[PDB]
Write a protein that binds this ligand. Sequence first.
Ligand code: HEM
Ligand SMILES: N#Cc1ccc([C@@H]2CCCc3cncn32)cc1
Length: 463
Amino acid sequence: TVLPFEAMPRRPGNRWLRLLQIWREQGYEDLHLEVHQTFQELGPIFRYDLGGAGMVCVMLPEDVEKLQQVDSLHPHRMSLEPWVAYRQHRGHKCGVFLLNGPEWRFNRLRLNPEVLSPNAVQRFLPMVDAVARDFSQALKKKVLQNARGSLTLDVQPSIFHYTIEASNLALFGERLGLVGHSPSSASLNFLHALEVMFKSTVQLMFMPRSLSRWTSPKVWKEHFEAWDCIFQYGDNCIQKIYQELAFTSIVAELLLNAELSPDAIKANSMELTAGSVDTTVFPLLMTLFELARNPNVQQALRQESLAAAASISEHPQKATTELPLLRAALKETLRLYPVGLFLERVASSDLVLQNYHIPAGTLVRVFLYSLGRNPALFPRPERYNPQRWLDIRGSGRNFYHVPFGFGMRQCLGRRLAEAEMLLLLHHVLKHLQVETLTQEDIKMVYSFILRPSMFPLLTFRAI
Ligand code: HEM
Ligand SMILES: N#Cc1ccc([C@@H]2CCCc3cncn32)cc1
């Protein structure tokens, strides 16, 4: 009863013209919408032919489960060519984000204890809480410096600085000063290189290195120069940490472990640094936006955080356990606005998705934008209702929330990202109320990650 792979519904359109249409623009900003529309038309599975190959698109938790069942010991995710190109050119190692096969697993097993283990989280969470406190106090100060105790501003830069500040402190044990009003020029240079590296990544990742090296030599120059600044900052930090180990951070533990070479430690530390760029910031912004649009949800989160403020202050780690509604609020935000638009696996072995045979080597992509909007799973999917997550009780409900991926290749920074998001929202919601003038949905664009095209100004008010 299993249908052949070739009988799978195909998305209409010309696979070759569409690829040229992508190169015409160095982007595919409406990917989430165009895929979402196709699901509505053809069902929960279809093939998207693009150029010489394509992708099988799915959106159901049961498909995620079947994908994790055929996860080999080395789950295969396509490497990001422009990033790999820089490593080979300069002679750097590739980290877990870019690696595949045995070398990935070798690196992964020697990183999990220092990045994901409960002991690791116990270590750096008080560090993140400190940075979150600085942000909230600085913001609360600006609000009260105002005439009416109310401030309207663009919070994306400051929140983005927070995520970089907190992550860099956990990774290298150094404060960049980005939450302060006057950071050093070195810190600003580093931050600019990160932004340029991400920008140039989008410009290059949609065509082969063979071609893009002709059509855009200056983009590659910007990309490698940005990476040079990043790896230069990483070399300095790792060297400094190493010297001081002969007389507290994630890299220090990795150096003490001595399981990975200094080059491998650096490679993974740069991909962890890159991992906090244009990721954690956006769920934070979209949560604030939705809390401004749903005052009752915001007030419920404030009562929760105010009730647990004392214990959290004594033990910051309690923010990850004693704030269940805030955790649900993050699930609801990521349900509607997943950072990673899709999860990607190259089928290591044959499998069956939606009664269709999937040959080994097929590129399968789970589109979370469509997964989270399935009404049969999230009734009234357009509604921002964090309470739904305390009530879900399906047998396979652990696959309803996979914004960080699944299996052994799941986001290595998940615990760090969750800590950063929870601690910031907790400390902000304690003393401040967020409001928005516009109540309409804002547009998202797919540019490597899913982000708002133009996040609006928000108004903060003291209680
Ligand atoms: C809301 C925030 C974030 C989301 C939604 C997110 C999402 C993801 C997803 C979907 C993957 C692919 C997992 C898979 O293929 O199964 C991934 C991988 C990864 N993420 Fe994140 N990420 C976030 C933040 C971060 C942060 C802050 C860091 C580092 C400080 C980070 C580091 C990594 C790394 C190193 C990998 C590669 C893991 C591997 O391939 O073994 N991420 N992330
Ligand atoms: N598949 C996939 C996939 C898509 C985007 C991302 C993003 C972007 C690159 C670095 C990063 C760290 N954490 C999340 N990300 C990660 C994975």
